[PDB]
PDB file of all heavy atoms in Angstrom:
ATOM      1  N   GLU A 122      87.398 -79.167-109.335  1.00 57.30           N
ATOM      2  CA  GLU A 122      87.299 -79.922-110.580  1.00 57.30           C
ATOM      3  C   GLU A 122      87.920 -79.189-111.756  1.00 57.30           C
ATOM      4  O   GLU A 122      88.483 -79.817-112.655  1.00 57.30           O
ATOM      5  CB  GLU A 122      85.874 -80.353-110.871  1.00 57.30           C
ATOM      6  CG  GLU A 122      84.856 -79.241-110.874  1.00 57.30           C
ATOM      7  CD  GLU A 122      83.483 -79.791-110.987  1.00 57.30           C
ATOM      8  OE1 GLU A 122      83.007 -80.403-110.012  1.00 57.30           O
ATOM      9  OE2 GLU A 122      82.858 -79.665-112.046  1.00 57.30           O
ATOM     10  N   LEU A 123      87.858 -77.867-111.724  1.00 56.54           N
ATOM     11  CA  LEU A 123      88.443 -77.039-112.760  1.00 56.54           C
ATOM     12  C   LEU A 123      89.938 -77.310-112.855  1.00 56.54           C
ATOM     13  O   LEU A 123      90.459 -77.642-113.928  1.00 56.54           O
ATOM     14  CB  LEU A 123      88.196 -75.564-112.447  1.00 56.54           C
ATOM     15  CG  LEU A 123      88.744 -74.549-113.450  1.00 56.54           C
ATOM     16  CD1 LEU A 123      88.109 -74.729-114.811  1.00 56.54           C
ATOM     17  CD2 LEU A 123      88.512 -73.151-112.941  1.00 56.54           C
ATOM     18  N   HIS A 124      90.607 -77.232-111.722  1.00 57.09           N
ATOM     19  CA  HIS A 124      92.030 -77.469-111.656  1.00 57.09           C
ATOM     20  C   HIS A 124      92.311 -78.965-111.904  1.00 57.09           C
ATOM     21  O   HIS A 124      93.301 -79.318-112.559  1.00 57.09           O
ATOM     22  CB  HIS A 124      92.574 -77.005-110.292  1.00 57.09           C
ATOM     23  CG  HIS A 124      94.073 -76.863-110.214  1.00 57.09           C
ATOM     24  ND1 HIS A 124      94.716 -75.688-109.889  1.00 57.09           N
ATOM     25  CD2 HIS A 124      95.055 -77.776-110.387  1.00 57.09           C
ATOM     26  CE1 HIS A 124      96.023 -75.923-109.878  1.00 57.09           C
ATOM     27  NE2 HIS A 124      96.286 -77.177-110.176  1.00 57.09           N
ATOM     28  N   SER A 125      91.391 -79.838-111.439  1.00 58.99           N
ATOM     29  CA  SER A 125      91.519 -81.282-111.655  1.00 58.99           C
ATOM     30  C   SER A 125      91.529 -81.619-113.144  1.00 58.99           C
ATOM     31  O   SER A 125      92.124 -82.611-113.567  1.00 58.99           O
ATOM     32  CB  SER A 125      90.418 -82.072-110.941  1.00 58.99           C
ATOM     33  OG  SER A 125      90.459 -81.865-109.539  1.00 58.99           O
ATOM     34  N   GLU A 126      90.866 -80.820-113.930  1.00 59.36           N
ATOM     35  CA  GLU A 126      90.934 -80.986-115.344  1.00 59.36           C
ATOM     36  C   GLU A 126      92.186 -80.319-115.900  1.00 59.36           C
ATOM     37  O   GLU A 126      93.112 -81.008-116.359  1.00 59.36           O
ATOM     38  CB  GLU A 126      89.671 -80.453-116.015  1.00 59.36           C
ATOM     39  CG  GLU A 126      88.432 -81.266-115.688  1.00 59.36           C
ATOM     40  CD  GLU A 126      88.583 -82.705-116.114  1.00 59.36           C
ATOM     41  OE1 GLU A 126      88.421 -82.998-117.325  1.00 59.36           O
ATOM     42  OE2 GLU A 126      88.902 -83.574-115.264  1.00 59.36           O
ATOM     43  N   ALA A 127      92.261 -79.000-115.728  1.00 61.05           N
ATOM     44  CA  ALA A 127      93.314 -78.156-116.310  1.00 61.05           C
ATOM     45  C   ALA A 127      94.738 -78.639-116.016  1.00 61.05           C
ATOM     46  O   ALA A 127      95.607 -78.583-116.886  1.00 61.05           O
ATOM     47  CB  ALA A 127      93.144 -76.716-115.856  1.00 61.05           C
ATOM     48  N   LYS A 128      94.975 -79.113-114.819  1.00 59.64           N
ATOM     49  CA  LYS A 128      96.306 -79.560-114.443  1.00 59.64           C
ATOM     50  C   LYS A 128      96.354 -81.040-114.130  1.00 59.64           C
ATOM     51  O   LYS A 128      97.392 -81.542-113.704  1.00 59.64           O
ATOM     52  CB  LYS A 128      96.829 -78.758-113.254  1.00 59.64           C
ATOM     53  CG  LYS A 128      97.231 -77.328-113.578  1.00 59.64           C
ATOM     54  CD  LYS A 128      98.479 -77.302-114.440  1.00 59.64           C
ATOM     55  CE  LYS A 128      98.942 -75.880-114.714  1.00 59.64           C
ATOM     56  NZ  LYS A 128     100.257 -75.838-115.391  1.00 59.64           N
ATOM     57  N   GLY A 129      95.271 -81.745-114.391  1.00 58.38           N
ATOM     58  CA  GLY A 129      95.219 -83.163-114.050  1.00 58.38           C
ATOM     59  C   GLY A 129      95.275 -83.388-112.540  1.00 58.38           C
ATOM     60  O   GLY A 129      96.351 -83.606-111.970  1.00 58.38           O
ATOM     61  N   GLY A 130      94.121 -83.365-111.919  1.00 58.84           N
ATOM     62  CA  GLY A 130      93.988 -83.471-110.475  1.00 58.84           C
ATOM     63  C   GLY A 130      94.615 -84.708-109.907  1.00 58.84           C
ATOM     64  O   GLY A 130      95.424 -84.619-108.988  1.00 58.84           O
ATOM     65  N   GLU A 131      94.275 -85.859-110.467  1.00 58.00           N
ATOM     66  CA  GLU A 131      94.831 -87.124-110.004  1.00 58.00           C
ATOM     67  C   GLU A 131      96.347 -87.171-110.162  1.00 58.00           C
ATOM     68  O   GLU A 131      97.051 -87.715-109.312  1.00 58.00           O
ATOM     69  CB  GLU A 131      94.192 -88.321-110.701  1.00 58.00           C
ATOM     70  CG  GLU A 131      94.220 -88.277-112.218  1.00 58.00           C
ATOM     71  CD  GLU A 131      93.883 -89.610-112.817  1.00 58.00           C
ATOM     72  OE1 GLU A 131      92.736 -90.072-112.682  1.00 58.00           O
ATOM     73  OE2 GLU A 131      94.782 -90.242-113.396  1.00 58.00           O
ATOM     74  N   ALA A 132      96.839 -86.571-111.226  1.00 61.38           N
ATOM     75  CA  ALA A 132      98.264 -86.535-111.502  1.00 61.38           C
ATOM     76  C   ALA A 132      98.968 -85.669-110.474  1.00 61.38           C
ATOM     77  O   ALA A 132      99.947 -86.095-109.843  1.00 61.38           O
ATOM     78  CB  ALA A 132      98.517 -86.024-112.910  1.00 61.38           C
ATOM     79  N   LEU A 133      98.426 -84.476-110.267  1.00 62.08           N
ATOM     80  CA  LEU A 133      98.961 -83.531-109.299  1.00 62.08           C
ATOM     81  C   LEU A 133      98.932 -84.153-107.910  1.00 62.08           C
ATOM     82  O   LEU A 133      99.932 -84.137-107.202  1.00 62.08           O
ATOM     83  CB  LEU A 133      98.134 -82.235-109.320  1.00 62.08           C
ATOM     84  CG  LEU A 133      98.652 -81.084-108.453  1.00 62.08           C
ATOM     85  CD1 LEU A 133      99.978 -80.560-108.984  1.00 62.08           C
ATOM     86  CD2 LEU A 133      97.622 -79.968-108.373  1.00 62.08           C
ATOM     87  N   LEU A 134      97.800 -84.751-107.565  1.00 61.74           N
ATOM     88  CA  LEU A 134      97.600 -85.396-106.271  1.00 61.74           C
ATOM     89  C   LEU A 134      98.583 -86.555-106.079  1.00 61.74           C
ATOM     90  O   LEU A 134      99.077 -86.785-104.974  1.00 61.74           O
ATOM     91  CB  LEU A 134      96.151 -85.878-106.140  1.00 61.74           C
ATOM     92  CG  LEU A 134      95.739 -86.507-104.804  1.00 61.74           C
ATOM     93  CD1 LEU A 134      95.918 -85.521-103.655  1.00 61.74           C
ATOM     94  CD2 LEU A 134      94.296 -86.973-104.877  1.00 61.74           C
ATOM     95  N   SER A 135      98.883 -87.265-107.152  1.00 59.21           N
ATOM     96  CA  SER A 135      99.858 -88.330-107.093  1.00 59.21           C
ATOM     97  C   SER A 135     101.251 -87.775-106.804  1.00 59.21           C
ATOM     98  O   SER A 135     101.998 -88.358-105.999  1.00 59.21           O
ATOM     99  CB  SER A 135      99.834 -89.163-108.367  1.00 59.21           C
ATOM    100  OG  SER A 135      98.567 -89.790-108.515  1.00 59.21           O
TER     101      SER A 135
END
Side-chain angles (χ1 to χ4, degrees):
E122 54 188 71
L123 180 62
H124 195 122
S125 299
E126 293 301 281
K128 287 291 183 172
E131 54 166 67
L133 186 67
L134 184 60
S135 297

